[PDB]
Amino acid sequence: SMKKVSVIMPTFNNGEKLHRTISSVLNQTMKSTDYELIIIDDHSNDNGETLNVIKKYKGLVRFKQLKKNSGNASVPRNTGLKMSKAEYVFFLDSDDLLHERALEDLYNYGKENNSDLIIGKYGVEGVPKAIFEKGNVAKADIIDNSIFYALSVLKMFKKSVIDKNKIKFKTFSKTAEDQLFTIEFLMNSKNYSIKTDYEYYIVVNDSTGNQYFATINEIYKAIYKSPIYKNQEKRHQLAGKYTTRLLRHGQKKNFANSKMKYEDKIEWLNNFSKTINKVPRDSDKYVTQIFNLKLEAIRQNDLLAVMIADKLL
Amino acid sequence: MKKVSVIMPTFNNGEKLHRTISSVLNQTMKSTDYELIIIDDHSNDNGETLNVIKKYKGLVRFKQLKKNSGNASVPRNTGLKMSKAEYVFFLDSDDLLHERALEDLYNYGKENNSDLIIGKYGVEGKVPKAIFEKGNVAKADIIDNSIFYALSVLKMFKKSVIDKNKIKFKTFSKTAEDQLFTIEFLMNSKNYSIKTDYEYYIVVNSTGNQYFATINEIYKAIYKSPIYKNQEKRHQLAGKYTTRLLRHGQKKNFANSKMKYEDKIEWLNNFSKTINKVPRDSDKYVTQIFNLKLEAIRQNDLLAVMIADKLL
Amino acid sequence: MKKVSVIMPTFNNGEKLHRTISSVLNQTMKSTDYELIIIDDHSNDNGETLNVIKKYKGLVRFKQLKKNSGNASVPRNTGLKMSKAEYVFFLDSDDLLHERALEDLYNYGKENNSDLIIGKYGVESVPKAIFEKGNVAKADIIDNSIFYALSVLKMFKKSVIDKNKIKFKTFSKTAEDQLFTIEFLMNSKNYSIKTDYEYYIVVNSTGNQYFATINEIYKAIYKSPIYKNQEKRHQLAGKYTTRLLRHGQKKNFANSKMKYEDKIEWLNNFSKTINKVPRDSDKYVTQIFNLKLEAIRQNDLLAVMIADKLL
Numbered sequence: 001s002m003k004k005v006s007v008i009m010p011t012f013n014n015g016e017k018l019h020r021t022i023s024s025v026l027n028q029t030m031k032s033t034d035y036e037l038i039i040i041d042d043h044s045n046d047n048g049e050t051l052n053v054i055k056k057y058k059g060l061v062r063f064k065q066l067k068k069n070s071g072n073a074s075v076p077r078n079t080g081l082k083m084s085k086a087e088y089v090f091f092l093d094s095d096d097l098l099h100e101r102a103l104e105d106l107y108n109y110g111k112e113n114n115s116d117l118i119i120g121k122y123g124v125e126g127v128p129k130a131i132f133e134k135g136n137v138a139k140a141d142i143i144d145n146s147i148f149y150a151l152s153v154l155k156m157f158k159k160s161v162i163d164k165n166k167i168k169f170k171t172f173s174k175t176a177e178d179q180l181f182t183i184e185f186l187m188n189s190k191n192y193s194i195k196t197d198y199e200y201y202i203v204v205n206d207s208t209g210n211q212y213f214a215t216i217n218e219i220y221k222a223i224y225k226s227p228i229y230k231n232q233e234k235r236h237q238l239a240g241k242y243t244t245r246l247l248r249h250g251q252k253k254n255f256a257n258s259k260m261k262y263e264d265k266i267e268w269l270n271n272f273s274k275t276i277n278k279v280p281r282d283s284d285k286y287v288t289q290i291f292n293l294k295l296e297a298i299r300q301n302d303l304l305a306v307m308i309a310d311k312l313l
Numbered sequence: 314m315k316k317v318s319v320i321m322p323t324f325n326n327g328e329k330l331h332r333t334i335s336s337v338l339n340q341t342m343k344s345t346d347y348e349l350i351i352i353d354d355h356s357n358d359n360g361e362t363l364n365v366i367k368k369y370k371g372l373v374r375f376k377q378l379k380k381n382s383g384n385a386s387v388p389r390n391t392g393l394k395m396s397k398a399e400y401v402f403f404l405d406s407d408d409l410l411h412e413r414a415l416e417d418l419y420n421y422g423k424e425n426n427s428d429l430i431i432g433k434y435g436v437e438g439k440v441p442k443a444i445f446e447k448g449n450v451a452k453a454d455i456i457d458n459s460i461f462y463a464l465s466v467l468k469m470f471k472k473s474v475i476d477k478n479k480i481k482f483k484t485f486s487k488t489a490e491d492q493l494f495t496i497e498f499l500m501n502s503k504n505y506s507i508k509t510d511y512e513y514y515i516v517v518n519s520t521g522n523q524y525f526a527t528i529n530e531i532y533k534a535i536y537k538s539p540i541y542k543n544q545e546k547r548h549q550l551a552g553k554y555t556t557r558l559l560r561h562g563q564k565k566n567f568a569n570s571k572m573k574y575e576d577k578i579e580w581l582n583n584f585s586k587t588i589n590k591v592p593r594d595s596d597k598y599v600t601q602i603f604n605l606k607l608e609a610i611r612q613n614d615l616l617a618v619m620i621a622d623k624l625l
Numbered sequence: 626m627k628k629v630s631v632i633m634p635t636f637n638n639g640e641k642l643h644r645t646i647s648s649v650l651n652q653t654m655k656s657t658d659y660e661l662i663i664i665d666d667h668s669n670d671n672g673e674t675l676n677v678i679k680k681y682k683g684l685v686r687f688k689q690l691k692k693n694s695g696n697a698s699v700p701r702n703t704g705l706k707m708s709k710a711e712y713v714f715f716l717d718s719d720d721l722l723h724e725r726a727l728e729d730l731y732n733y734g735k736e737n738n739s740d741l742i743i744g745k746y747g748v749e750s751v752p753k754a755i756f757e758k759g760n761v762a763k764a765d766i767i768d769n770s771i772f773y774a775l776s777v778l779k780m781f782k783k784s785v786i787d788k789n790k791i792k793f794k795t796f797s798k799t800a801e802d803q804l805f806t807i808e809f810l811m812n813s814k815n816y817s818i819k820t821d822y823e824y825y826i827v828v829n830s831t832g833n834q835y836f837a838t839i840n841e842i843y844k845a846i847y848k849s850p851i852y853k854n855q856e857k858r859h860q861l862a863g864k865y866t867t868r869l870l871r872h873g874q875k876k877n878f879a880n881s882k883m884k885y886e887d888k889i890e891w892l893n894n895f896s897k898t899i900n901k902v903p904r905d906s907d908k909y910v911t912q913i914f915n916l917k918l919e920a921i922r923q924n925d926l927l928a929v930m931i932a933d934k935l936l
């Protein structure tokens with residue numbers, strides 16, 4: 001009997017707080033025997049506090065401790081993926097909470113719709129919006145349902161897609177690697193669903209650009225190599241819409257007139273410029289028109305022009 | 314030698330062409346003093362246009378080209394060679410002449426020894442303005458009477474000027490060929506007249522290689538003028554044309570348009586190359602709001618042109 | 626030792642010079658406690674200016690240069706060599722002192738051990754920000770807007786000038802006076818501002834020499850023995866850059882009727898000079914100028930033109 005869902009949760013120095021997160025997972029409307037919680041501790045060093053909490057649920061979770069701290073969720077999440085033989089996986093960050101109906105509602109909706117990906121609406125304690133404005137969507141589309149604006153991995157993923165395509169979290173970047181996983185997944189599957197009956201996942205709140213733009217480069221390459229979105233114009237459309245999201249919400253989007261040092265601005269822009277210049281210009285017509293000059297200035301690797309563009313926005 | 318030769322190119326006009334023809338044949342000028350030369354550009358509308366012309370047999374002259382030239386140039390050059398008249402008046406095949414058009418322009422022209430006479434334009438449907446705002450001008454000035462803003466050939470031109478200086482319409486440009494004709498004429502003649510008593514002419518409604526080749530010829534016409542020989546005067550005329558080009562040129566706002574990037578580069582490259590053959594001495598005569606755009610173009614900097622356009 | 630030497634260069638002033646000399650000789654300060662040193666820069670006005678000066682023999686000190694130098698620098702340097710007074714005051718041959726100028730400025734300077742005393746200016750537009758907080762015993766270059774009041778028409782402690790060998794440069798015919806005041810400011814600590822009266826009444830290029838002088842200002846700042854902290858030098862330099870963009874020669878050259886070729890040479894000189902200034906100073910420049918400053922660093926005329934359209 002293959003499990004319906006593996007919840008994959010990295011921990012690091014969470015301490016007593018973790019009780020509430022683990023409890024939200026163990027308290028599900030889904031039958032306890034139909035799912036599992038996989039905890040991967042990224043070598044906590046908080047005088048055993050995190051491990052003491054995990055040990056209180058010994059027998060109710062699967063657990064692996066890493067021997068050295070990796071520094072972020074990527075290696076721990078990859079470890080979880082190797083351990084899961086479930087139908088779907090769900091990534092849960094150690095500080096957050098699941099609604100008690102999250103696994104049952106998202107899995108059932110997935111099964112009903114043969115979904116590769118099921119996105120439950122996010123709540124916040126103390127998050128994306130447009131994707132959830134249309135109610136439940138059985139067969140969502142990346143552009144029409146604003147999925148480029150909600151690329152966290154805090155979602156339910158069909159494990160066969162991940163295994164067949166060898167999708168792993170990259171360990172070369174401490175930013176945007178989550179975006180990349182979700183994009184690789186989307187580019188290798190067709191059926192996406194959006195479930196909004198409850199706030200199913202609660203988010204609890206508390207550089208050169210080399211690695212960042214390397215990650216961005218991998219996003220565009222995933223679009224342009226997609227076995228699902230094979231048509232070259234659809235690839236241009238997807239790429240141009242991603243470019244738009246990047247210019248709206250990207251890191252240091254307004255770096256050019258910022259207090260960043262000149263030599264850092266030049267390195268940042270060199271990275272951005274060489275990244276976007278590997279993207280066909282055929283994608284540019286799908287970028288929102290207000291960004292025409294800023295995008296061209298970035299292609300031209302011209303800091304003065306980006307400065308000017310930003311002043312005219 | 315007839316007074317006026319109305320040279321009218323035709324192409325797939327149909328039954329609506331009747332209006333135009335009768336506007337020429339119903340002039341107040343003595344019937345035997347003018348001639349309508351119709352030059353069909355090898356119409357291909359299943360005889361429709363041909364059948365309209367045929368009904369004026371005996372009243373018009375008609376030559377037909379073996380093959381479609383693609384625009385009014387070659388036909389007009391055919392009309393020029395045929396006409397042996399004092400003045401020529403170019404008439405497009407959908408437009409109309411006021412009944413007192415040929416008489417009033419010719420008399421005014423003969424009165425003032427004019428090489429060129431410009432009648433005020435009217436409109437049907439949903440034309441230059443400034444040139445006609447002072448009423449009739451006997452001896453006009455290109456700059457003062459805004460002649461660079463009314464460069465269509467829909468005017469009365471003295472034939473001897475054309476013949477002596479071998480002014481021909483260029484075939485190698487689908488755009489701005491009319492401007493070049495008028496400009497070559499202006500740079501090889503001295504007396505220009507404006508007549509405004511009535512709306513005399515009624516207007517009825519590329520990588521840039523060829524286009525900027527034509528623009529280039531305009532500047533060359535100015536700087537080699539045997540009429541305007543002073544080097545500073547040539548600079549003034551050139552600079553004043555630059556302003557007109559920036560105000561009303563083809564694809565003036567190409568920089569922020571939906572044109573492909575590669576096409577924008579080629580277009581700007583041609584524009585840049587052309588303007589950089591124009592002395593910077595002309596730049597001071599350009600309207601000051603265009604200072605940045607003009608320099609952006611001399612520098613062949615598409616970003617700077619994009620920015621310039623955003624600030625205008 | 627005299628309390629004050631007034632140093633006044635003259636050139637072809639003629640009879641008008643009487644007023645200015647009278648304004649100096651009619652001070653409330655005791656006549657024995659101060660001198661007027663007049664250095665004529667070889668006037669050529671058919672003896673007229675020198676004839677005026679001769680009428681005060683025994684009441685002033687006087688030297689005439691062998692040849693005209695072309696501006697106040699050489700004459701003023703000559704005056705410095707002649708004064709062995711406690712303080713000097715540069716007065717121009719067309720301006721007027723208030724009768725209580727030397728006394729009030731000297732007294733105020735003595736009481737606050739001032740290296741520099743600045744009296745409020747009148748006019749027959751002169752700096753105003755420096756004077757808007759009333760009297761200031763110990764002024765700050767930045768808080769009291771001194772970079773916006775760099776004329777030498779002020780009272781300077783002579784020991785500072787002597788010890789540091791501060792001389793007027795004869796490089797260019799613009800900004801030499803700024804450089805003098807800056808060199809002095811960077812080698813002294815105590816400055817005073819006195820505003821009781823209008824003490825001093827002001828009576829109304831390739832860029833090669835000019836930008837050479839600006840370069841000298843930045844150098845003065847960066848080798849200052851007083852402001853010795855490196856971040857403090859970056860701050861002062863940034864504040865000067867701001868003053869330069871606000872009030873500099875041909876500050877709006879880019880969109881001007883200047884010939885294109887002259888614009889390029891001008892900007893080339895401005896660019897070369899500013900690029901000798903550490904970028905670490907740039908963050909202290911008023912942010913509205915961020916683009917204009919970068920465009921000058923980049924030696925990009927189109928970018929400067931654009932920056933000026935947006936200002």
Ligand SMILES: CC(=O)N[C@H]1[C@@H](OP(=O)(O)OP(=O)(O)OC[C@H]2O[C@@H](n3ccc(=O)[nH]c3=O)[C@H](O)[C@@H]2O)O[C@H](CO)[C@@H](O)[C@@H]1O
Pocket residue numbers: 009010011012042069070071072073074076092093094095152153154178
């Ligand atoms: C608003 C926002 O941008 N949220 C993102 C942010 O969360 P956020 O900034 O909240 O990151 P967290 O502190 O929740 O850490 C993310 C996860 O990584 C684990 N961890 C942390 C450090 C470590 O050395 N090893 C380790 O495994 C934590 O235990 C946790 O499970 O980054 C996460 C990881 O990319 C994303 O899932 C979130 O969507």
Ligand SMILES: CC(=O)N[C@H]1[C@@H](OP(=O)(O)OP(=O)(O)OC[C@H]2O[C@@H](n3ccc(=O)[nH]c3=O)[C@H](O)[C@@H]2O)O[C@H](CO)[C@@H](O)[C@@H]1O
Pocket residue numbers: 321322323324354381382383384385386388404405406407465466467491
């Ligand atoms: C508003 C405006 O800018 N109008 C111009 C435009 O006219 P417009 O755009 O109205 O063009 P028209 O339809 O009037 O055609 C112009 C003339 O060219 C002839 N023709 C057309 C097609 C063809 O293959 N061969 C041919 O000879 C037509 O019969 C007509 O006599 O172009 C004309 C020719 O440059 C100019 O005189 C007009 O000033």
Ligand SMILES: CC(=O)N[C@H]1[C@@H](OP(=O)(O)OP(=O)(O)OC[C@H]2O[C@@H](n3ccc(=O)[nH]c3=O)[C@H](O)[C@@H]2O)O[C@H](CO)[C@@H](O)[C@@H]1O
Pocket residue numbers: 633634635636666693694695696697698700716717718719776777778802828
């Ligand atoms: C508003 C303004 O910024 N005014 C400045 C301008 O004064 P301004 O424009 O008033 O220049 P002035 O004519 O006063 O000349 C300054 C002094 O230099 C002398 N002189 C002049 C020519 C000459 O060949 N030799 C010579 O010694 C004059 O006699 C006078 O004493 O330049 C002066 C000297 O840089 C500065 O002190 C003033 O602050």
Ligand SMILES: [Cl-]
Pocket residue numbers: 023
């Ligand atoms: Cl518990």
Ligand SMILES: [Cl-]
Pocket residue numbers: 058059060
């Ligand atoms: Cl158990």
Ligand SMILES: [Cl-]
Pocket residue numbers: 074075076078079171
């Ligand atoms: Cl790994």
Ligand SMILES: [Cl-]
Pocket residue numbers: 136137138139
């Ligand atoms: Cl639906």
Ligand SMILES: [Cl-]
Pocket residue numbers: 141142143144
């Ligand atoms: Cl889509």
Ligand SMILES: [Cl-]
Pocket residue numbers: 142143144146147148241242
């Ligand atoms: Cl989108």
Ligand SMILES: [Cl-]
Pocket residue numbers: 148149150245249
């Ligand atoms: Cl986003």
Ligand SMILES: [Cl-]
Pocket residue numbers: 128149150151152153
């Ligand atoms: Cl998200």
Ligand SMILES: [Cl-]
Pocket residue numbers: 167168169170177180181182184
């Ligand atoms: Cl990935």
Ligand SMILES: [Cl-]
Pocket residue numbers: 184187188221222223225226227
């Ligand atoms: Cl892919």
Ligand SMILES: [Cl-]
Pocket residue numbers: 176246249250251
């Ligand atoms: Cl991002």
Ligand SMILES: [Cl-]
Pocket residue numbers: 257311
């Ligand atoms: Cl800004």
Ligand SMILES: [Cl-]
Pocket residue numbers: 290293294308309310312313
């Ligand atoms: Cl912009």
